[PDB]
Amino acid sequence: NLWVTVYYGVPVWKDAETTLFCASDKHNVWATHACVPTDPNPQEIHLENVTEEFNMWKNNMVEQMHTDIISLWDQSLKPCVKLTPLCVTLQCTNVTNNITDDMRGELKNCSFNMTTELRDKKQKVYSLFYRLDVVQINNKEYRLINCNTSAITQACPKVSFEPIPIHYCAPAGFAILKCKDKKFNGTGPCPSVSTVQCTHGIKPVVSTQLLLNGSLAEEEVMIRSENITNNAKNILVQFNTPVQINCTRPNNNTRKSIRIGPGQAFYATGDIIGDIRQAHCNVSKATWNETLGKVVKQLRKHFGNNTIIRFANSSGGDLEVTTHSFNCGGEFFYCNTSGLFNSTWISNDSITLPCRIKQIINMWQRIGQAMYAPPIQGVIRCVSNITGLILTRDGGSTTETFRPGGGDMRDNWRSELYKYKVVKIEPLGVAPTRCKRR
Amino acid sequence: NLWVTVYYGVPVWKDAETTLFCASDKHNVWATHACVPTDPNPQEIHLENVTEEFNMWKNNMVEQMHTDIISLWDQSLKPCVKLTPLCVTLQCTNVTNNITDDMRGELKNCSFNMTTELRDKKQKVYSLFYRLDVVQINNKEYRLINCNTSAITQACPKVSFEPIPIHYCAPAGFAILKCKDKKFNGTGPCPSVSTVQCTHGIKPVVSTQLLLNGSLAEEEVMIRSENITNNAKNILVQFNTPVQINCTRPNNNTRKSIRIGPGQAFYATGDIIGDIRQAHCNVSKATWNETLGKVVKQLRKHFGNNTIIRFANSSGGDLEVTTHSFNCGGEFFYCNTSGLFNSTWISNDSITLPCRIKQIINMWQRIGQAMYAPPIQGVIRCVSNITGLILTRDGGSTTETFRPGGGDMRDNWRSELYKYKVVKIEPLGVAPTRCKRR
Amino acid sequence: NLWVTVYYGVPVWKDAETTLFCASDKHNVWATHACVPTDPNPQEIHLENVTEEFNMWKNNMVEQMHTDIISLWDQSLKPCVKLTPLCVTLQCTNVTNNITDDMRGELKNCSFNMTTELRDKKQKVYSLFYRLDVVQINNKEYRLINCNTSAITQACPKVSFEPIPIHYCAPAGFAILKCKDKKFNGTGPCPSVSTVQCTHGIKPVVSTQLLLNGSLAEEEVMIRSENITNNAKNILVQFNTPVQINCTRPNNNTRKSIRIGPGQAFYATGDIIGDIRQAHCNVSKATWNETLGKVVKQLRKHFGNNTIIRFANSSGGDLEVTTHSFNCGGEFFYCNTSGLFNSTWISNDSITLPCRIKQIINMWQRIGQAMYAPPIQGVIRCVSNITGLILTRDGGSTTETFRPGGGDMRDNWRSELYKYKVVKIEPLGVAPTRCKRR
Amino acid sequence: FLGFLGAAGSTMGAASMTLTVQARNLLSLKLTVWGIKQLQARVLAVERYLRDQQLLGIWGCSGKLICCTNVPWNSSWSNRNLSEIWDNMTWLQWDKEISNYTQIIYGLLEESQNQQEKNEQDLLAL
Amino acid sequence: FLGFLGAAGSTMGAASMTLTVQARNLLSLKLTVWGIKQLQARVLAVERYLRDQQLLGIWGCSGKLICCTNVPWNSSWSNRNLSEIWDNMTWLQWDKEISNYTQIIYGLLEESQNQQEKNEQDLLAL
Amino acid sequence: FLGFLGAAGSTMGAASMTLTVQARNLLSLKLTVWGIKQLQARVLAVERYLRDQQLLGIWGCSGKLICCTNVPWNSSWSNRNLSEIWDNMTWLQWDKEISNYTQIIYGLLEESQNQQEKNEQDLLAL
Ligand SMILES: *[C@@H]1O[C@H](CO)[C@@H](O[C@@H]2O[C@H](CO)[C@@H](O[C@@H]3O[C@H](CO)[C@@H](O)[C@H](O)[C@@H]3O)[C@H](O)[C@H]2NC(C)=O)[C@H](O)[C@H]1NC(C)=O
Ligand SMILES: *[C@@H]1O[C@H](CO)[C@@H](O[C@@H]2O[C@H](CO)[C@@H](O[C@@H]3O[C@H](CO)[C@@H](O)[C@H](O)[C@@H]3O)[C@H](O)[C@H]2NC(C)=O)[C@H](O)[C@H]1NC(C)=O
Ligand SMILES: *[C@@H]1O[C@H](CO)[C@@H](O[C@@H]2O[C@H](CO)[C@@H](O)[C@H](O)[C@H]2NC(C)=O)[C@H](O)[C@H]1NC(C)=O
Ligand SMILES: *[C@@H]1O[C@H](CO)[C@@H](O[C@@H]2O[C@H](CO)[C@@H](O)[C@H](O)[C@H]2NC(C)=O)[C@H](O)[C@H]1NC(C)=O
Ligand SMILES: *[C@@H]1O[C@H](CO)[C@@H](O[C@@H]2O[C@H](CO)[C@@H](O)[C@H](O)[C@H]2NC(C)=O)[C@H](O)[C@H]1NC(C)=O
Ligand SMILES: *[C@@H]1O[C@H](CO)[C@@H](O[C@@H]2O[C@H](CO)[C@@H](O)[C@H](O)[C@H]2NC(C)=O)[C@H](O)[C@H]1NC(C)=O
Ligand SMILES: *[C@@H]1O[C@H](CO)[C@@H](O)[C@H](O)[C@H]1NC(C)=O
Ligand SMILES: *[C@@H]1O[C@H](CO)[C@@H](O)[C@H](O)[C@H]1NC(C)=O
Ligand SMILES: *[C@@H]1O[C@H](CO)[C@@H](O)[C@H](O)[C@H]1NC(C)=O
Ligand SMILES: *[C@@H]1O[C@H](CO)[C@@H](O)[C@H](O)[C@H]1NC(C)=O
Ligand SMILES: *[C@@H]1O[C@H](CO)[C@@H](O)[C@H](O)[C@H]1NC(C)=O
Ligand SMILES: *[C@@H]1O[C@H](CO)[C@@H](O)[C@H](O)[C@H]1NC(C)=O
Ligand SMILES: *[C@@H]1O[C@H](CO)[C@@H](O)[C@H](O)[C@H]1NC(C)=O
Ligand SMILES: *[C@@H]1O[C@H](CO)[C@@H](O)[C@H](O)[C@H]1NC(C)=O
Ligand SMILES: *[C@@H]1O[C@H](CO)[C@@H](O)[C@H](O)[C@H]1NC(C)=O
Ligand SMILES: *[C@@H]1O[C@H](CO)[C@@H](O)[C@H](O)[C@H]1NC(C)=O
């Protein structure tokens, strides 16, 4: 004789999708102040004896992070100056003083009539626009690149672009299962599961070809792909050691405030004090070659020991996908990175990457909402780690070529949410037992 | 001896007002995607032995639906192009090429200076405006009709106005009582009450004189009024059989995209390919006469067998109330309907209703928020059923005349929420059982 | 043997901060129609034996009220006409017809080109601007004072500025502790505590130097300061009896509606019918002198019986700080309160305070969001009681001088939320009792 | 089984046969027009369900569909015979005639639970 | 003590040792992007906790972590011996094989509580 | 009857006389400034009440205003006599001086409830 016995609080969970709130330990774009204060001591419980199936390519956490990151970006651009008056004909001349050979024609000295705070009065002002932000109309006549596509909103200079780590915390009745396996590809069973209330600090770093400021693999370089035999699936590489990248903007730019209306100021670019040099990034030649030597070593596992793995540069497309686009100190660099993926592999010095600057930014691959990044005063210099790559393979029927990829920003945060999954706790369980209700 | 006994979950309800959420089974105006997915099999429970009072004229569901429809309409026009530059002087000439006699002067060929994407440049473009949208200023000079009164917002062309059925579902602890009486009036007790979680698909069809796309009476034509002896109360007729109305806009209109700013496009009307004919609706003469014969038969009950019931057309007023205004594929028709209400009743062929198109639309009887309906490419044709009428009687001291009414959109949705009622479940009850707490 | 016993519902509270909602017993700036209807009979319980520590200067209710009042002010100015076209050059002449000696140069007759409904046409309109709203540009050329600093939004004329009392009600599980001590100076133990669900009607009256239409002290004039020995801390005086002040605007102003766009109307000032006199406030000379006699009597307690207490006028600063700024009938006065604070105190007639009018208002000491108060038709007259003061002392090493203060609006509502305190009910308590669980 | 409110027209005894079916239906995004209405309905259902559960716990009847108590039924509330109530009358009619005595009945149930719980504590203390 | 879901991989008997550590973790601003996500996470937690508590109350098991009932094991749901269930198998494996018999088991618990509660009232009425 | 927190300053015994009046007051639109505040207040009240009820039910005291249990008074939490505690002292002072042993007391109640529920299930199996 067996009687149905109901138990409450049993450790049973099911895969589910839920709204994960933020926790965080000057105002940011990500509004980390609106995030609830996380606990000083995170409570992680190791789930011994447990083997749970994971899949980062079908992970809803990545998709939910993408929507939140875009929403946070959009909400910080609402109380900001709308530069619709800037869509006017510009008389741009060529910035040709104290410039080097690599910066010839990259800067434009644009003069235009501007609206004054008084509606009936005009204002002839000038500004320095990069060649990537102005397009000629057929000194010559130019216009902002977005004027025929988007309405440009100036980013508020008091809002920081710096990625502050954010922890995605599941509500009560939900748990986040951290896979603690160190040789784990994004798909398959992970027999080292643990339950943490919520994830580590995941910096929303926006980059295309190199994963900056990320989380390193514990033991060895990890090659993770949705389908390694499919050339249309991006390959996410994770480095066991960080590759430092020095990124600087040598020009000593000055922000000039142009009052374009009542309470509205358009921060233009004044003349550069000193010489004008090309923005660039150095990656150590010795460190990069060693890391590529490790990448190919774990890349031969999925392609054979006798295959020829060659690294070539980008294949073409937008400047966002063909260049290592990233944000450094409030200015958006677009670095070539053709000297990085250039060698071929068979069985003190630095690499300088010539970067280009843009101020009109169409981000998240959205057509209609452009942003003007105001100039940053002084010289910008940031030091980051390249903690991963986004490689794309080319089809073939003895050599395999891997070109850098990007574009989709979900690939950038998938490299951080690969070890996490959201489960729905089911505390009601029934089991036959000799006990009977009196 | 009798001790009180508290019972939980008793079937007791009281009349109450609550917030009913939407459920629904290209983006839509009413955002039916935001509605929760309704169950595939509705759970309807018959409440035998139960007689509940109903009143469709004091029903809060109708008032609540009116606010929701207006709010849904307002929120779909927020991320849409504001046509404030359109309020400019227009030089309009009549469209006199390949037109019939009925379209002489209805179309205006208006040319005007428009702001382009560049602030300092002007763009001389032309568009075809209907005579009902432009008002002369004293080729001649015209202006949009709303320019002294409202700020016009162009309807987003990718958002459809097609009425998708919506189910108004009460939260937990609330029930919706459905009257299954097939001879049920608008007021009084309903011997056959039933509980359903929420209502059938109620299409938010906007019309004034004829109730289109509606729900048919089960047995006979039903005449419903708040006070049948008051001529100031509208009479809501419901048809037991549907009267099919075919509405077409024969013109081959072309949508022309005029770019009035950065990221803003004003969709104008290009030249019509072919001849220009008048928009019209056909109602079958035999079918319409038969339905009026049934309406008068059910209308003599409240007015005597020897009374003379005559159908005259609408009295004076706005074009919305004097014409059968409705929406057909994104274009707003305004049909005369003077040949429908035309006869006097004593004890293959079609009726063509000449309609007029409008693009600047003021609905919900609101002054201050106009909307520009962008042109629809190609020929528009609709097939609908007239499932009811909104008649208004004229005062008198032997004949009764019934003119079509409208204007108030709540009467359009009152014809669908007449059988429904929101009640508040009260599960706590006390009874004198012999049982005594030990 | 003592086994613990858990008790639920024990009367225990702890100090906590929570969100207090509104309750209130033509639309209003503070949406009291959105406040829940308060009970007709408030339920207050006298907490005998209870001595609770209070602090008005660390009270979170004051800080929360400040955010709510600003938020209500901001949300009532969102659906209002934006007067961005008003920042145009003005040709202003002095209004010198039928004016008195005190109004020479106070009113300006400004004419300006203004945008009409049609984008391509302009209208030459005129308006009467006070000298405090226009600033000269170097008849002469003027401009609105806000036009280099803020974007001005015209206050909607249908929204009333009258302070309707609001009750700040704590949610369930929270209680509001009310000090019944009539000699309570705002800090320290309160031997007479009562618990009410929420506070009395606290009118959000906005004023700087005199606390108008407020709550009177029960027994004696109460001097309340955070640190009476610190001259940087404002002194809040509360009157046991009200001092009545009539403030009038004798000019019979006319509101002229200038249509500045589609659906946008700018309400200008037409010519005054009759003579133009100076706005002023009456204060009874006998009543005010008696009240100062009571204030100094209660002020000698904190400064000695032999000290010399002198009242001087405002030292300097903005017009909001140096004048008794307040709102009377929809127009903002700025009064010359120097005949009030003039006397020196040693051990039928009225005082006329010449006030000045402003239409461009920067509320809450915020730089960036100006407001245009539309003219009020007719003659404005309002009667109020001065129920307190905000005095500021000057440093010294035998006499003490007390100048009026203001600016910070939290001090205005601190005088109403001084007796209230928000506590968090903790209904779980453990005690040792001779029980054992079965 | 008849469903939610299936025994609405049933007699008192037949309605009490299925008190559970109505008991389980009392409890079971963006800030758009439908999102807010759907959120307000979720919070309204929770606080409404919790209010009745709190009352049952106040009277010492939590977790019981049928709970007997220890306060007398005054004949002023209703003098109808037991047979004609549970075999000839429905729950809708019961509340209609006792809607005014409900609050005083609730107060009587309130004091009985606290009084008997003091007795349970004191009797057990021995 | 192991923590929340600490005995997730432990045996059923060992998992039942700390049923409470998972029981107390099932329940525990502006309208910005994070504020709305925080609010809808609080309401979702409240509803999810209340649905399980309601089910326990429906079956007459409110306030008890372990509750015995009066509905038989049909032997088609599971014919495994008791020894290997509570000493050689975990709770996760249990729900996997009985995920489809759950609703019919729940309905049986529903009628048993109402049936015995009527019996309790009738027996006590004597 | 004194009202909500009427016996706040009364002795322990007088306060326990009317625990229910404070017990019943712990639980009982557009997105404007006041609407969101009202909604957040409602949600906060609901979750606070549910947390308190959950803590009560973890110790097996759901539905009981006075619940007496099986964990000892350590005599380091307090050594005051019963007469002076329950006749010359108030709950405010009680909580003030026992604000720090609260968590360990709660853990003791939790473990006692779990152990006694295990014992009840094992004894009932016979
Ligand atoms: C990867 O991480 C590094 C270190 O966290 C990031 O570099 C940091 O970037 C911020 C600005 O984005 C630098 O702060 C700035 O410092 C300058 C000079 O003190 C100051 O004038 C600015 O106001 C601002 O505070 C910070 O110094 C810098 N840390 C370094 C260089 O060690 C890097 O940007 C990250 N990579 C990204 C975001 O792609
Ligand atoms: C302090 O409280 C008094 C009494 O409520 C306020 O006086 C009143 O002020 C209002 C305007 O704020 C006056 O309203 C006006 O009344 C006329 C005549 O009905 C009407 O045509 C106007 O449109 C407007 O409603 C009201 O007459 C006046 N009455 C009294 C008794 O003085 C006073 O303004 C308050 N002081 C403040 C808020 O500083
Ligand atoms: C990146 O590396 C380049 C060289 O590879 C650095 O350029 C040198 O800068 C030093 C000053 O620090 C000069 O003395 C050299 O003449 C430069 N070498 C050139 C121009 O070939 C550059 O400073 C580095 N940028 C960083 C570290 O941000
Ligand atoms: C409505 O009915 C009219 C006739 O009453 C239709 O007009 C006819 O259209 C056909 C083509 O289908 C022509 O051959 C006839 O010459 C037209 N008759 C006229 C103009 O008198 C009209 O097409 C119908 N519209 C619909 C069904 O949408
Ligand atoms: C404030 O007081 C002054 C005088 O002290 C008032 O002005 C007088 O008003 C009366 C009419 O009520 C006139 O006859 C007098 O000529 C005015 N001047 C003087 C010097 O008396 C003033 O009206 C008062 N303010 C009010 C009533 O709002
Ligand atoms: C402010 O105005 C009020 C009138 O609205 C004055 O009150 C009047 O005072 C006179 C003389 O004292 C009385 O004859 C009237 O009966 C009063 N009218 C009332 C009470 O409605 C008040 O005196 C004025 N205050 C000052 C300081 O001048
Ligand atoms: C200016 O730079 C542009 C590059 O955009 C180049 O095409 C042009 O020839 C340059 N003009 C001169 C005078 O060097
Ligand atoms: C500004 O406008 C004037 C108008 O004639 C024009 O001459 C001048 O070139 C403009 N300056 C620009 C576009 O920089
Ligand atoms: C990923 O890991 C799983 C489990 O370790 C393994 O079965 C699979 O072959 C690996 N590779 C891919 C492409 O799934
Ligand atoms: C143009 O149309 C109008 C109708 O609005 C009419 O009055 C006028 O006579 C027409 N003129 C010509 C030349 O057709
Ligand atoms: C555009 O502006 C010019 C300016 O003179 C005017 O001549 C012309 O008629 C305008 N075009 C219109 C109103 O269509
Ligand atoms: C007009 O008033 C100003 C003060 O705002 C003064 O300086 C000027 O002299 C006046 N002009 C006259 C009175 O003509
Ligand atoms: C309006 O504009 C005309 C244009 O020349 C100017 O002459 C006149 O002075 C202006 N009127 C004002 C600014 O009041
Ligand atoms: C207010 O009263 C308390 C009571 O102890 C006292 O300590 C405090 O100093 C008083 N404040 C002032 C400003 O006198
Ligand atoms: C309705 O009434 C009939 C006879 O009065 C009765 O037999 C039947 O059971 C009632 N309905 C229900 C659902 O009990
Ligand atoms: C894992 O399984 C072993 C036996 O297979 C058992 O002894 C151990 O207790 C289990 N782990 C946990 C955390 O209970």
Atom of ligand 2 nearest to the CA of C376: 23
Residue A433, min C-alpha distance to chain F (Å): 8
Give the span between the Cα atoms of B21 and B298, in whole angstroms: 36
Contact F109 C49 (CB under 8 A): no
Cβ-Cβ pairs closer than 8 A, B with D, add up to: 181
3-state secondary structure of B177: strand
Give the span between the Cα atoms of E13 and A193, in whole angstroms: 21
CATH 2.170.40.20 fits A3-79+160-425, yes or no: yes
Residues 6+ apart with CB under 8 A from B79: B156
Number of alpha carbons in the 13 Å side-chain half-sphere of residue B436: 10
Give yes or no for a contact between A165 and A155, defined as CB atoms under 8 angstroms apart: no
Amino acid C196 reads: V
Report which secondary-structure segment, H or E, holds D15.
Answer: helix D12-16
Give the span between the Cα atoms of A78 and A156, in whole angstroms: 9
Give the span between the Cα atoms of F53 and C173, in whole angstroms: 13
Residue in the block written with tokens 């807010």: D36
Residue in the block written with tokens 């009046």: F21
3-state secondary structure of B199: coil
> Atom 14 in ligand 8: which residue has the minimum CA distance?
A112
Token couple for A11: 């450790």
Enumerate the H helices of A214-343 as residue ranges.
285-299, 319-322
SS3 content of chain E, % helix, strand, coil (to 5): 60, 5, 35
Token couple for B366: 């609101």
Q: B365 exposed, middle or buried (CB, 10 Å; 0-12, 13-18, 19+)?
A: exposed
Residues 375-434 of chain A whose Cβ lies under 8 A from any Cβ of chain E: 425-434
Give the span between the Cα atoms of C266 and C253, in whole angstroms: 15
Give yes or no for a contact between B142 and B105, defined as CB atoms under 8 angstroms apart: no
Residues 6+ apart with CB under 8 A from D41: B18, B19, B20, B21, B170, B171
SS3 content of chain A, % helix, strand, coil (to 5): 10, 45, 45
Residue in the block written with tokens 């005062």: B395
Give yes or no for a contact between B359 and B130, defined as CB atoms under 8 angstroms apart: yes
Give yes or no for a contact between B272 and B103, defined as CB atoms under 8 angstroms apart: no
Q: Give the residue from chain C lying closest to A259, CA to CA.
A: C148
Atom of ligand 16 nearest to the CA of A48: 13
Closest by alpha carbon to C353, among C342, C344, C370, C340? C340
3-state secondary structure of A66: helix
Q: A273 exposed, middle or buried (CB, 10 Å; 0-12, 13-18, 19+)?
A: exposed
Number of alpha carbons in the 13 Å side-chain half-sphere of residue A168: 26
Closest by alpha carbon to B295, among B226, B237, B347? B237
Contact A434 F121 (CB under 8 A): no
Alpha-carbon dihedral angle through residues C295, C297, C302, C305, given to the nearest 10 degrees: 150
Residues 6+ apart with CB under 8 A from C100: C275, C276, C277, C278
Give the span between the Cα atoms of F32 and C74, in whole angstroms: 11
> Would you kindly state where each structural domain of chain B is located, as residue ranges?
3-78+160-425
Report which secondary-structure segment, H or E, holds F92.
Answer: helix F91-97
Give the span between the Cα atoms of B253 and B357, in whole angstroms: 12
Give the span between the Cα atoms of B292 and B343, in whole angstroms: 9
Positive or negative: CA dihedral E71, E77, E79, E85:
negative
**Cβ of residue A205 lying under 6 Å from some atom of ligand 1:** yes
Per-residue CA distances from D86 to D83, D93, E60, E122 (Å)? 6, 12, 25, 14
Residues 59-118 of chain F whose Cβ lies under 8 A from any Cβ of chain E: 60-63, 110, 113-114, 117-118
3-state secondary structure of C229: coil
In chain A, count H helices and then E strands. 4, 35
Token couple for A201: 């600090």
Phi then psi dihedrals of residue C286, to 5 deg: -70, -45
User: Three-state SS string across A332-397, please?
Assistant: EEEECCCCCCCCEECCCCEEEEEEEEECEECCCCCCCEEEECCCCCEEEEEEEEEEEEEEEECCCC
Is B435's Cβ below 8 Å from some Cβ in E?
A: yes
Closest by alpha carbon to C11, among F62, D55, F92? F92
Give the span between the Cα atoms of A299 and A292, in whole angstroms: 10
Give yes or no for a contact between F64 and E60, defined as CB atoms under 8 angstroms apart: no
Give yes or no for a contact between D22 and D5, defined as CB atoms under 8 angstroms apart: yes
Give yes or no for a contact between A34 and E32, defined as CB atoms under 8 angstroms apart: yes
Give yes or no for a contact between F79 and D80, defined as CB atoms under 8 angstroms apart: no
Give yes or no for a contact between C384 and C309, defined as CB atoms under 8 angstroms apart: no
Beta strands in A71-150 (DSSP E): 90-94, 107-115, 122-130, 134-136, 140-144
Length of chain F in terms of residues written: 126
Residues 6+ apart with CB under 8 A from D54: F24, F27, F49
Give the span between the Cα atoms of B322 and A354, in whole angstroms: 71
Number of CB atoms found within 10 A of residue B68's CB: 22
Token couple for C383: 């009667």
> Atom 6 in ligand 6: which residue has the minimum CA distance?
C246
Q: What is the DSSP letter of B102?
A: G
Amino acid E53 reads: Q
Phi then psi dihedrals of residue E54, to 5 deg: -60, -45
Contact A3 E70 (CB under 8 A): yes
Is A121's Cβ below 8 Å from some Cβ in F?
A: no
Q: What is the DSSP letter of C376?
A: P
Enumerate the H helices of B247-395 as residue ranges.
285-299, 319-322
Residue in the block written with tokens 């843009």: A358
Atom of ligand 2 nearest to the CA of C326: 39
Contact C428 F10 (CB under 8 A): no
Q: B81 exposed, middle or buried (CB, 10 Å; 0-12, 13-18, 19+)?
A: buried
Token couple for A380: 């910008």
**Cβ of residue A131 lying under 6 Å from some atom of ligand 7:** yes
Which residues, in sequence order, are bridge partners of residue B99? B276
> Atom 13 in ligand 11: which residue has the minimum CA distance?
B112
Interface with chain C: mutation pick from D47, D117, D124, D126, highest number of C CBs within 10 Å: D124
Give the span between the Cα atoms of A70 and C299, in whole angstroms: 59
Closest by alpha carbon to A178, among A207, A159, A198, A203? A198
Give yes or no for a contact between C435 and D124, defined as CB atoms under 8 angstroms apart: yes
Token couple for E12: 């059923």
Which residues, in sequence order, are bridge partners of residue F72? C3
Atom of ligand 6 nearest to the CA of C245: 27
Per-residue CA distances from A46 to A53, C31, E87 (Å)? 16, 52, 21
Closest by alpha carbon to C207, among C157, C247, C250? C247
Asked how this structure was determined, the answer is cryo-EM
**Cβ of residue C188 lying under 6 Å from some atom of ligand 12:** no
Domain B3-78+160-425: homologous superfamily in CATH: Human immunodeficiency virus 1, Gp160, envelope glycoprotein (2.170.40.20)
Residue D118, min C-alpha distance to chain B (Å): 15
3-state secondary structure of A240: strand
**Cβ of residue C185 lying under 6 Å from some atom of ligand 14:** yes
Number of CB atoms found within 10 A of residue C301's CB: 10
